[PDB]
Each structure stands twice: as C-alpha cells, then as structure tokens.
Design a protein around this nucleic acid. Sequence first.
RNA 1: AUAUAUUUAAUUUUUAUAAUUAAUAAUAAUUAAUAUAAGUACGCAAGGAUUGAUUAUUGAAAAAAGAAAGAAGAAUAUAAUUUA
Lengths: 165, 142, 87, 137, 434, 141, 232, 323, 297
Amino acid sequence: KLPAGKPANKSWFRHNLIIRRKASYRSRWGTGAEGYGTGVPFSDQVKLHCVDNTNCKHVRLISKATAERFAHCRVFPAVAHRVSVQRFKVSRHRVKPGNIYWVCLLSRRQTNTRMSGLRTNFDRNTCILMNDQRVPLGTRVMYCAGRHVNHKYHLKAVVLANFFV
Amino acid sequence: GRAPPVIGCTRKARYAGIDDNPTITYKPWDTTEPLMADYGWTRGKLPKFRARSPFHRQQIARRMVTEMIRKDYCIVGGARAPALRILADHVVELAKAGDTDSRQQLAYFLHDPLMVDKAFDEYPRRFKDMNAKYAMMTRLKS
Amino acid sequence: LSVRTEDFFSKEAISHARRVSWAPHTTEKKQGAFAKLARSNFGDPLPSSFAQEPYFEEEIEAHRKHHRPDVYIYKYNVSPTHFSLRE
Amino acid sequence: DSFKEHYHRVHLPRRLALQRYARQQSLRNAAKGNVKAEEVPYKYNRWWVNEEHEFVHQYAFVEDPEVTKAKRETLPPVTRENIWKEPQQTFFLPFAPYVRVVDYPKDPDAKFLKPVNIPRWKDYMQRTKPVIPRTWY
Amino acid sequence: RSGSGPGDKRIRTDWYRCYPSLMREKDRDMYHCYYPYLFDHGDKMSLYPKIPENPREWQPEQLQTTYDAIREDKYDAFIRLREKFPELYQDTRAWDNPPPFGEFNMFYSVRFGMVGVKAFTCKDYDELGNQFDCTAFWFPDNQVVKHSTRNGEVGTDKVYVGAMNVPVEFHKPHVAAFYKAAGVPVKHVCAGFPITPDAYAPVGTKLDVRHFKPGQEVTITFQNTDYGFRGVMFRHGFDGGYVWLGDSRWQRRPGAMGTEGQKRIYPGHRMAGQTGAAAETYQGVPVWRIDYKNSLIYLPTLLDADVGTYVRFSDTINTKGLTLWNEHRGLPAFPTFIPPEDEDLSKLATDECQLKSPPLYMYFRDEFPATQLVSQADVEDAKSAKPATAPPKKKVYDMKKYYEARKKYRQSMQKARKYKLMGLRTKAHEKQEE
Amino acid sequence: GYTRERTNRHFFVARANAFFSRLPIARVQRSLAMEAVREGRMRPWKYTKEQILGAPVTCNFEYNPRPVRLIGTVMDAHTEETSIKGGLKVYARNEETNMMLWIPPGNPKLRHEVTSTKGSFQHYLDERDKWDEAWITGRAR
Amino acid sequence: VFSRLNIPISSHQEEQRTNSRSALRVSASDTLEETIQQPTSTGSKQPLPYDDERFADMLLEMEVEGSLDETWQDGRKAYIEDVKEILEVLRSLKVRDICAIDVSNKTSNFDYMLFGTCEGPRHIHLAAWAVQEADALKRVCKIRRKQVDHTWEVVPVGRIIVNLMQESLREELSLERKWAVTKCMDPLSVANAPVSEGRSVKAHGLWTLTLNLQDLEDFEVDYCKDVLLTQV
Amino acid sequence: EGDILRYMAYDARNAQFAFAPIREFPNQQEFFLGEHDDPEKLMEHVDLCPLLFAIPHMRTVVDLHAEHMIPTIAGPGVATSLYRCIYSKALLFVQVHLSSEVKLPPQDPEAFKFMWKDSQVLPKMRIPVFVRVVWPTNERMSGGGGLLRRFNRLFGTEFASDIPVDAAMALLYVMQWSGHIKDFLGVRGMRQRLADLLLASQQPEPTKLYPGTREIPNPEYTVAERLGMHVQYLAQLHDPDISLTIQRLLPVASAPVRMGCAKAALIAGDRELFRHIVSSEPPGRMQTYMTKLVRKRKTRDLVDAEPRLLEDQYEFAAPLWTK
Amino acid sequence: PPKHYSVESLRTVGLLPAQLALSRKPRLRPHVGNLKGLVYPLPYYAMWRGNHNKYTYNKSTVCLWGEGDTRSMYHQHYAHAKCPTDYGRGGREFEYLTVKRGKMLQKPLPRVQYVAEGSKPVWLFKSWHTPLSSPSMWEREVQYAEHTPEHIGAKRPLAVVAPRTMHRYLFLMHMEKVTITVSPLLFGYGHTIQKAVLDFYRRAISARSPFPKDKVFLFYAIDHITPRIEVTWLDGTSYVPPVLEGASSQDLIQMVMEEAWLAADRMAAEGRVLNPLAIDDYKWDQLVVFKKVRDKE
RNA sequence: AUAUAUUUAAUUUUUAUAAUUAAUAAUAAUUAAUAUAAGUACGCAAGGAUUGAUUAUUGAAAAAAGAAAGAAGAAUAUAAUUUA
Ligand SMILES: [Mg+2]
Ligand SMILES: [Mg+2]
Ligand SMILES: [Mg+2]
C-alpha cells in the first residue's frame, strides 16, 4: 500500500489515458443520438475491421479512448489480431499478427450526431493501418471515410480514400 | 446542436412539471385508446393505487368497472377512485362509439358479458347529451 | 465602428514631466532619432524601471538655479521665483 | 455568534448611526432655506504611469441626485432606429487586423515595398487594448 | 444549492489573465502623471503646492515655489496645442470636460433586465449549417413596479419589475396590499435588479422585449427541475463511497512517527439528499432570435427547468476582459427601449417582427476550419470578398444610357414585394369575381 | 447544515402554465416552419407513414472539398405535416458502405429531396431486410 | 471571369453529369415512328438486370425525369486552366510523366488529380513549394516544412489535388490507372445487392453479398470492383 | 459644419489602404519629387493645395522616428497618400519610399552611439518621394496633346499627351511652392541624373567628415550610395530599358551600387536578374541583406549560383526565380 | 457599395477571431461567484483587493509614504510632488474605480502668469530632426516678448531647462580664454584647493579643442593671491568659479561647463553665430578609452 | 457489519423582494492536433525556434417574514375545450 502513510490510487497513469465522465444526472454519456458529445469512446480491446488492401483483417485497439471527436488530436495504436492467409504468394502483405501500427478510424456502428444534426449509423466499425509517419500501408480503401477524416492530420488517408460521408 | 443538461428519460418528482426537451421516449402501448391507459405518478398517467403487481392492479380495475356498470355506483378507497372514474368515462366513450371493435374491447375488459350488453344498451341514450365527465366522484367524510 | 489606422501602432507612455514636448513631431520615442541616424531597428526591451522609492528634488530654471542671489528678509530667503526658510 | 459576527452585529447599527450623523450636516443647509447638493471636487489626476512604464487610468464617476430624480420622474426618449434594428456583434474585431496580402507592389514577394499602413503581426498580437491616451473601445 | 463541494478541475480558471496593471498610491506624484499634475489650492487649481499662510509652518528645506518656468512653459504649450489642434489632440480631451452623468457609460452603466416565461423548445439552423436546440421564452407583461435604495447609500439602488398581470383574487392579501401601495397593475411575480442611478426608469414603464438586442449575451436565473430525494449515485455519482479529499498530517519518510486522523464528517461531504428545485444561473448565454410581436426571446441552450418557470433575464456586464456594450460591438437601448409613437404592432405580422443574430461560429462545426481541412472549394460571391484593389471602372460612352440603366435597376430593386402585394390586393378587390 | 438545496422563494415556486392561452405556441411553430419554407431551407410536406416510407430520397450534403451525393429509401418519418421537428430516417447503401441517416429538416447544408412521389411498401420491406442482414453481419466475430 | 489562379476562362462546362440520362439533356427531336417502335418493343415486359427491380425502375424514372440533376447541381467545379497552369509549372520544374485525370463525374472528393514523378526528396519539396507559390493568390496555408514522407507529397489546390512521387512509389500506388479504369457514377449502382464481409454456414447471404478482395491484386480490384457487384 | 469637415479630413488618415481607389482610372504616370530629410513638409504642401480637395481618400503621416517607419536598408516600405483633383477628378498617389537606403547598419551600435550621442550637427536625409498621376481616357479634358506639349517644352517637364491640366498645374504649383522645381523630373531627368552620378563616381570624390567603417559607418551619403539610390529611382519611374541599364551598370558597380541595382531589379520585377545579381555578389553583409530583402524559400536558392551538393542531390531555383 | 473589414473578410484572409459566447474555455469572469451586490462593467476593478468588494466603509488603511494619512506628516518629496487632497488608499486598496454622490465641482484650470494680455508669442517647432544636444530643444516653446531679456541684448528668452550631464572634460569652443592663477610656493599643510586648481589646469590643457594651448594660460602670483580661475567667453564676459575648500577638479569642470552652456545660450539669444560640436580626434581618442573600458568590464 | 451519541447531507411545505458582514465548490508551474508570426530570428551549412487562436477534455446554482389534518393532478399533461 504505497505510500505507507497516505495510500493513494494506483491508477494515476490510467487516469491520464482514459476519458471518463462521472455518471451523475448532469454528466452522462448516453447514446450518440442525444446530440453532439454524447457518444461513448471506444475502450481498449475493441475489434475493428481493416479495409485497406493489407494482409490484416481485424485489429484490436490499444487506446483507452477512441472516438471521432478527437481523431485529429490523438494517436490510436492497435495490434493486428487477424491476418488474411494467401495460399498462393510487398510491405502491405508483410503484415504479421501481433504487430503494432497506428489506425485511422473511418466509421463506427454507434450513433454519431454531427453538429448539424445529422445522425449516422454505419454498417461496421472501420479503420485503416498507418505507420508512425501517418502513411497508410495499403494503396486503396474498400469502405467509406467519415467527415472527421477531412483533416490535415489524415492527409494521405484522405488522398487514398475515394468516398466520404 | 447539443444535448439537454440531463439526457435520457429521468424519473422526476411526483409534482414536477414537464421538461419539453428533445428526448427519445417510448410508450409501452397506445394509451390513447380507452381502457388501455397506463398507471403512474406523472400527470399523463392514472394514479396507481396499491397492488401486488400491474396484473393485480388491472384485475382490481376490471372488477371495479364491472361492479360500477352493474349497480351504477361504487364506494372505493384511496387512489382507486380517480382510476375508476376515468375508466367509467372510457366505458361510456366506448358505448357511445358503439363499434364492433368497441363491443369486443369492452368484452375483453369486463368480467360480465351481460354487463357489456347493459352498458351498450343504456349508456348511449343516457349520455347522448353530454360531452365529457359522465361519472361523478364525491369524497366522503367517513 | 470599423478598422481604423490609429489603433494599429502603440504610443509611448512617457510622463508629462519626463516629456520633452507635446508636439506631434516629438510624440514618438526619443531613441527613434538615433535609430534613424544609424539606419537600424533597435528592439531593446524593458529599458529601466523607476525605482523602489523614486524621490526627486525641485529643479529650478537653468539660470536661476545657479545665479540665485543671497537676498533675505526677516527670516526667509526671497527670490523672484521661490520662498524658503532661512535658519 | 463568532467574533466578527458579534462585532458586525454590534457595529452595523452604529455605522448607520454614524452615516445619519454625517447626513445631519447636509440637512443643516436645507433648514437654512438654501439647499445645495454635496459638492465633490473633480479629479484632474486620474492618468498615471506605473513603475513598469505602463499606462494606468482611474475611473471616478460622480452620481448627481438631480439627474437621478429626473430619470426617476421623467420618461426616457424614443430608442434610435439603428440602435434597436442593428444586431449586437458576436465577435470582437482586432484593433490591428493582420492582412499579409496587399496588391500594392508589382512583385508580391518583395518585402521592402510593403506599405506601412498595414499592421504587422507583432501589432496584431499586442494591440489588445486602445492606445495609451484612449480609454474607450 | 450554493455548491460547497469538492469542485471539478476540468474547467481551467485563469485569474492571472485577470489582473490590471498594478499601480501604487505612493506612485501618484507629479513625476508619474500623464497630464499636467494639478494641485487643489482650495477653489482654483494650481501648478504648484500650497504655500502655508503662516510662515512659521515652513520647513527648513521646504521650497515655497511661486513661479516655475519649466512647469509654466510645459502647461502653456500643452493647453495651446490642445486648443489649436482639436482633431490632433482629441484623446487628451478627457482630461478636462469629462462625460456628464446621465449618459450611458461604457465602464459604469448597468441597466435592469426582464422576467420571461419558458414557453417552448425548437431547433434552428444558422447560415453555416450549425444546428442549435433553442428554448423560446415569453415575456408577457414586463413593467417597472418599484424603486428601492436602502438607507440612501451608494450603489444600493435597484428596480423591481413585474411579470404577468393577474386578477385581484389571485394573490395573498399582503401581496395584493403591496401592489395596491405600489399603484401599478397587480403582477404575478416580481424580480429585483440592481442598477446604477443613471439607468432608472419611471415606475410603471412598459418594458419591451426589444430592451435586449438579438446578438448580445445575457445572464438567466431560473429554478431547475425537482428530482426529489435522490442518492449519491444519482447526484454527484461515482463518488461518496469513501472519505476522500482529506489533507492532514502524515509521514512522507520513515524518519519519524506522527499522524493526525479523521474523527468526524467534515462539512461538504457528498451524500444523498434533495436534488433539483434550486435557483440555477447561466452566465453569458447569447441571444439568438427576438420576436417582438409575441414577446419571445430564443436562447440556443436548453434548460433543466420546467415549462412555465419564470426566468430572470439580465445582461452580462463583461466577458473575457471586454465590456458587452461598447462602440465596437454596439450600444444598448439605455435606459430601456421606448417604441416610436407611429408604431402599431397590431397591424404587423408575426413573420415581420423578427430579429436575428449574426453567426455565433466561424465555420461549419461538422467540419474543421479552412486552415485545418485537407482541401476545400471557396465559393463566396455574396457573403464577402477579401480581394481588394478593385479594377478600374468601365469607360462610359453615354451618360444618358448610363443613367437610364441605373434608374431602371433602382426602380426594379425598390418595392420588390410591397408594391407587388399592393397590386395583387388591388387586383383582387377590383376583379369582383369577374 | 451549512448549505441548502431547495428554494422556496415566490418568484421561483410560482409557475405561469395557467396563462399559456395568451400565447399561440402552435401558431409560432407554424410561423417558424413557414419562414423556413419561404427561405428555402425546407419544402412543405404532408403524408402518412404508409405512403411516405419506402420512397427513394436524393440527398446532397454540402461538404468540403466536394458535396456528398447519396440515394436512400425512407425508413421512417417523425411528423406528418411540415414542422421544424419534422425529421426523416433514410437508409443509404453505397458500393460497400451501408448507413442509416436521420436527416433533420431545415438545414441549408443538407438538401434532401423525395423523388418517388409514392410509397413502395414492398421496397421498404426489402430495404429493411437488407439493412437488418447487413447490421447483423457487420459485427465482428 | 478568372479562375482560382487568376487566369481568364474561355471554355464552358456542364453543370450536370455526363453519365446522366435526362430528357432535358437529350437534344434529338422525337419521332412518331420511333415512339411507336419503342412502344411495340416495351409491350413485352422484361425486368432490369439489377437486383432490385422496383428500385431500378424507380431510379431510371428519376434519371429520365432529371430531378437527380436538379438535386446534384453544383457550380463549384474546378477549371482546366488551373490544371494547365500547374502542368506548365511542373514542366518548368522538369517533373516527368505529368498525368492529369478528371474525376468529377466519379465518386471522389476532388475534381482533378495530377500525378508527377520527381527524383529525390529535394526535387519533390521544390515542386511542392512551386505549386504552393503558383497557388499563392488564393491559398490559406503553406505546405509542411519537414517532409514526413520522402517519397510522396500531396498539395491541395482547391478541388485539384497534386501528387508528387518517385518512380517506385508511383508504380506501387498506380492511382492514375485506378482513377482511369474507374467508371463514372451511375445512380443505378445503388440498385445492386448490399455487400458485407460475413461468413455464413454456406458462405452465402440471403440479402447481402460476400466478396473477398485479399486474393485479388490491386489491378484486379480496380478492374473487377463494379464487375463483381453487377454479376452477383 | 467646419468641425465635421476637419474631422473627415483627419479620418482620411485612418482610412484603410485595401479599400483605397488607387487603380480607379486606367492611365497612370510616375514622377519624382526629390529627396527630403523631412517629407512631412512636402506632404503639408500637397495637403494645402488649392487644386485638390482638403479631404483626401487616404493620408499617411510620415514619422521617421516611429518604430514602424525607421528607414533601413530593408526598410519598412512606402508611406502612401491619395489626393483628388477638384476639376478633373484625377488622382495623385503620393509615395514616400523609406526603403531606398543602401547603407549597412553599424556592426557595434554602442560605439556609434558614443560617437554621435553629443553631436550638435546631424547630416541630411535622402528620402525619395514619388507621385503617380492616375487619370481616365479623355479626348477634350486634357486640352488636347498640344497644350501639354507646350507646357512640357516651356517647363522642361515630361507629361503625357492626355494628362489633365488640373493635375499638371497642381503638381507644378506644389513643387514651386515647396521649392524643388529642379528636383521635380521624370524618366529623362532621372537618366540625366544617373549620367551625372556616373561622371561623379568617375571623378575623384571629396573627403567626408570621417571615413566609413563596418563598425562605425558615416551617415553622410557618398557618390556610390547616391548612384544606387538613383538606379532605384529610375526603376521606380518605370523606365522601359531599366533592365538593360542595370545589366550594363552592374560590372562597373561598387557594393552599395550593386545593392541599389538589386533593389531596382526587384522593383522593376525581374526576378531572374535579381537572382543573377545575388549570385554574382561576393559573400558578405551586403549579400546577406540583399537576400533578406525578399520573401524566399531558402537562402541557398539565391546565394548558390551552381547547385550545392546536399545528400547526393542538387536543387534548382531557376524555375522559382524565373519571370 | 463601400467595403470594410469584417470577421468573414478576415476569415477569408486566414485569421479567425476568438470566441466570445460559445466556447469550452474559461470566459475570465472572476466576479461571478465572488463579488456580491452591484458589479460594474469595468473588468477586474476588484482583483487586487482580493477579488471581493467587502469592507469599503474603512477610511484609514496601512500605507507607506505618499499614501493614506501621510498627508498629515511632512516628507520632502511628496510635500512638493503630491497635493494633500489627492491621498487615497494605499497597498492593495488602490482605487481602480471610484463612485461618489453629489454635484461634481470642476475647478478652473490654472492660468499662465507674467503674460501680458494681447501679446502674440513666437512658437518654436520642436522635432526629433533637431539633435537633442542643440539648445533649441531646451529653449522655451511658447516664448513671449515680456520674457525676453533686452538689457543683455537677446532677441528671444533664454532656455528654462538645462542638460543633466556630469562633465568630465572641458570644451573650449565657446570660450575666448582661460587664465589660471596659482601660487608658486606649495602650502605646508595639504592644500586641496591648490591640488584641485592644478588638476583643473591639467584637464584644461588636455581639454577638447583643436589646440587648447591657445586658450589656456597659467600664471604665478608671488603676492600670495588665492588660486583662481577666470574664463572669458567670446562676448568678453568673465566668469570666476569660486574654489572653496572641498571642491575637486571634477566639480570645477562641472561648474565651468554648466556656465559655458548658459553663456552659449546667451550668445545664441543675442544672435551670435556659434560653432557647433561635432566629431574630432579628441572624440576618437575618447572612443579608444571607451573601448578599453568596455573590454575591461 | 452497528445511527445509540457526536458529525455530516437534506428538510421544517408561494418568502412579491439573494447580496451592508459570518462561512463557503473550480489560486495556470496543463497535454495533443492543426495554421499563422515564417519558411522569419538564430545557424558555416544541412537546418530552424519562442509565441496570446481554434478544436480536443461537455458543464453551469441564490438560507430562513403570513393563517396548513384531501391529490401540490379533481388526475385520462387544457385551470373547467359545449356538458342533463
Ligand atoms: Mg484489410
Ligand atoms: Mg469541430
Ligand atoms: Mg409558508
């Protein structure tokens, strides 16, 4: 029990990573349809699809908080959970399980209310793989990118994507 | 646009008014139709008298309405009286409507088909010249 | 209102006593003359603060303060510009 | 009651009695058949330069009982059409808006030909208040 | 309510940006003054200190100055420059001839507010595409009811304003007696607003909604929704499980042995109790829309109050180190709005008596600003155009045809809808179904 | 003990709900809707669910650097006549993307137009089944 | 009128899409014999090759009515004068293999995509800065000072994007071939069956489709993206 | 009424530059009004002209002692005023150039301040003033070409054949009232002054108060500095052969003359010639300041004539500084 | 229509203004829960007091010299630099804002004295184009005819403000001659007066002039005449700096230089054309010494 | 695993009306994305700072002077939507 005199919480570093909200009556997450700022961010150990033409299929999020509101100012690391098997054989194909890349989030299944009032429920959770320089490993994107992707933080992602909502 | 300071349907006090804020709220069933109202302590619902369950409460309400239609009056106690008066109004509304669906609904609700027939025979001609409030409730001093 | 050029450039907060004159040709900074002479921009900040206890003495005119005559009446010095106690 | 609570409980009536005793001297004049309002001197010394050579202004406002009675009794005039029709601005324009683009010189890259009417970036950043003698926005 | 909790450290208050330039009283001598330092001298101002009339009071090293050529020349040149160049020394004209009392003062004048009723809730979209869930408040009958000033002190004068005309049998006898003694129509509720004596209005003055401007910022006070006796998980949830935030003596090192424990519950301990039904105040809520025919004001925020609540509206005096009412943004209807004599709101329509505010944002909040977007298409032909240095005007060849075209454009622009409506009404009245 | 949560002042306890007949709230709402109609942010509509749901809707959303153009069938409506709280639920499916949009009426950036002029309840059922299958499939397993 | 780079414009454009099929766009005069032949042909009912027959018929009716163009009318199109100016700037910079593609009719975020081959990060950054200075009139920001990618540079000029790559990265991406092979947008494409990656008990969806693009190369995907959707 | 008129003529100072009708009329011409230690006196003369309105479109008070208007080698720029003619409605765009200096600042300011602190004599300042006459196309408002040709042959001036007689007489009266009728000239007069400065530079020069030094320079103007400043003036006056004159004068120019030639090429708009001058300039403070003059990408783009090998690569700035 | 700058125009340029009402950042209102009662729109007028408006009925406070009740006590500086009625609260209680009741009385401004009515004065235009070392910057700005000394022969009044310079050397340009009389024999006891006069002669020989030997002269008085200095200016007027006990050569130089400035001002007012000060070999040698001092420390 | 005492959080139900003082929840040593100062200052050069703005983190708080044994809804959100 550290410190011995006045024991404190051992989650001090976790508090710097999580985005929490006290579940009082004035502070609530709720569903995404209540308005802007009412969607619960993705926690850790969340599976996302990988829609770029890479060997990876599913990723698992490492971040304690992941959402579209702060997809421009926060980095989202993830681990390749499932990798496509090529029975008959570049950098995008060399994706091996367990590896850690960054992910650009494209869409979510949870309700997302824009500031204009347009709610959206996409088909499945979506993301694309990137390196530490924010350059996507794939050459094409097989899904739709969200409006939050339109930011200078995702320049190459916007260039490689072909459809936005 | 943003969300209200308190999001979601939050149970307020018994005498607190409405909020009139955008809130996704669903009703259990269509309570606008007669004899299908819900019981609660808000103003949009009938005052729920004490019962072991909603099923037991509905059974008490059914026997209350049956005896009311039977002998034209009923001496009740507590929160049962407003519910009985409103359900008697609903019965008179169904009788004045006089549809086959109204007959079948009053038969589903009541315990006595003879009382269903008596209601549909008497109440239309009885309250043809009345708009609403067909039942009178008097609080006794005993 | 609208955007006005008067608000673009800040002026000096020099005091009235420390001022040279209120003329529009002397409203600017005093070091600007030597800056123009040297053909260079000087960006020296925080030149000096006043003091912790800035006290000064009464200054007399450039000629009076040195050519004051020792003229006295009953117990006081007398000058065309000043009075003072004499012993 | 605590120390300060007891002190104020005892002294607030005494403070009001002292204020009444002060106003007694003002009522002395009205009983002489000559009513003169309180005469406060105007302060000609409300503009200063502090230790750090910064401009300071002391705001002194005097309330006139005659103007107060006039406003209590009489009706205010009609509001101006532009005052009640033009909306209140939601943003505050900078005193020195940096432009960064002027079509004066033939070659836009030439820095030594930019007109001096346009404010610089240091001005745009530091001019968050009117000029030294000015006091109103 | 009154708070008295542990507080939230998310809101980062910054008081270091809230200190004016420090000035000491000892530094108010004649060597620090910006203008010629003047001495009182009794009934006339002077440039020199007062000389004691008793010569025995003169100090040994004190200098009794009767004429200082330096001060004389400086003061003379200053006065003469200010007299000869008014437009050049305009900012120095506040030294003497100050602004008189009674007029609106940017840093002094505070005016009263009004009392509205939370009417309903709607949603409105701005020009940029931003949505706002707005609450519409109703101001039924605002009217100055009373003036108050305790002991005639300075800064304690306020005005009481009523809200809704009610019959005589509505109030308690003492409230009816209060309104009878006041002499104004019997109102439902009455709220007091502390003001300055230059912002007074006569008792019984009708207060129009146009008292507020459609783009200003207001402070509102209401009663939030009553939730009854609720628990520690409902109010200030995820807290109250253990005694937290306790600063007492404890040992940081194993050097010594001394501790001071907790022997009671300290005040402010978060527990269960009443929730809601409290006076809640919102500060700096912008005004969105003003309907001055139905007496309605729209606020882009939603409240935690019930419909029918009386909300006290006042104006926020300043925001972010800047005054609300100023020459840059705008001036208010001081002391209050007075309608013109020719106005008749009965002849006006609801769609006419509307006043909207300028946009509260700079970009489409769905997207990012232009400096942060990857790419954008800039198409603004009627909004504004920063392209300066307009090209030279076209060389005219015939003033006759030029003026003909100009007059034709002016005539086609003027009376586009009013003349059309008048002609349509005249045609409908002259047709007579023929 | 040292605080108080409730207020019993007359100004706050009093309510004005009894005097709401002097205020035409519904007329003000209709006036706001008509103002939106005449400004062009929305067009007046009047239909029932059985005749609105299932109609393709062409929605152009003004977004940088290029407006997004979608075609999606009506899944639900929130108001029969035109209103500031009208609402519209639209299922739009792109080449590989399926989305469920709720477009509010009166936004100048979200220009959606109903074009079918008819209901097509069978098409509504087909799109409902497609969306259900896609939603159940999209979950990671 | 002048373009975004302050260049006079002498070539007009169409506010509608070229792939559209609208009666207002059709300028050929009708004929009674042609109408009679078309009626005799349509007398035999035959459904459309798309999955949703009702939706396909409704979409074709909307297209021939032209309300789709009235809803998708967009006058914010770019100009070919800016593309030609950027081409001349890159030619002065000696950028090899300049390829411009108009993707305004196709599903994308930009009207024009330029692709250039530069040899080295120095040359890439020089070309990027030159494009920026050519766009200096209407630009609001500058390019990144530090190159985060020494083989790829992206310069946005309005609705025109400029990619500056090396030979290896250009041949690896092959974006020009992709945007050339990609067909223009057709509103009848949404009449196909929805696709979603889901393994069923028999690898078959009742209302959806299952296609795996991992076994297909980039060019195979570019060539068969719409082909597979139209087939299955 | 008079107070409002005065305050409008005053707010003419606060008028903004972007919204000024400088290019309101098609035709324009440039004239040089001479160099003034205190151009505010000439500005007051222009303000008090009977042929111009007392309320100008734009006014700029030239205060050389302001931190934003201190003349430097890479000076602050140009102070601009705009006056309107009463009878022809033409425009006079007065431009005080505070960036024509070709003298480097002292290396050690403390020594220069110690040297010139107590001096009771200061040298003159050579600050150029130009005027741009802007007028519309007129057939009968300028009095025909013959009237202006007669005025030119009588007063040795260079006016266009269609410049309004109103603006012509306004400029003539202002220059005569100020006493700089010899300084008022055009392109021909500027070419003659440049030839005179070339002859003076060929001739031996007299000794100034003290020789110039990179540590403590001499504030007095030398013949080479005057030659550079007048090359700048000839470029400002829109000479059609300014590039050829700069190319012919560069091989026989000193360091201040080459700095003036660089400024003149930059004013004329020949970025290629400017880059050639900067690349030919030997390394030093002069080259550093002529590089600092412009908005550039990298200093090597201007300094390095041949591409310097950086990471086995070569950069090229010819497309960046061409045309 | 005329165009002006607006928030939309500045946005198109590329600059966005700060949010005023809708912002998740602090709005800088420290008085929302701290100041009670009436609050004035002047921001931050009560922050130095401790962000509160309590205890305003107090009259006397803790105060240093020049603040508060200091007016009743004598201090040499404030007795001439502050009016005894302009003493306010001291310390953190400085009045950034003051509100009072009653009829405001605005006393009339002071009047310039010793100015005859109906006199048209000469106006002197002071600018920074004139060097600060010139006496014209120190000359009066509003100069009347009733202030001109005509008995001396001046066309204008004399300067009222003198330069504040510690003179370490002599400038013999406005001085016709300097005669220094000393005693040949040396006093028995240490004669500080004799030492100071000898040092003054040394510094006058080393003074700032092309050839100070032509103007400096030394004489010996066998008559036991006290050591004295006599400076004859260009107009013939003579000045005798009194050499008292304790005065140093620096003090004598300061006196001579101040009187030289006054004499040159008198010359300029009379109409005499004086040679100006400029750069010379003496100034170059002083620059050498200055660089030596700077390199040392 | 206990409200017995202390202590706290509430309450003592329209009080027309917070504020003269007691006491009391938010006293920057922030972090991340952009863009502008600027491709400046500063570096031999490759290079390259400091920096007040928007987002990101989604909340708002006023104590005591009036008549009291029903449901603070005559209850199906209207102060009686016709009413025998
Ligand atoms: Mg993948
Ligand atoms: Mg945003
Ligand atoms: Mg009570």
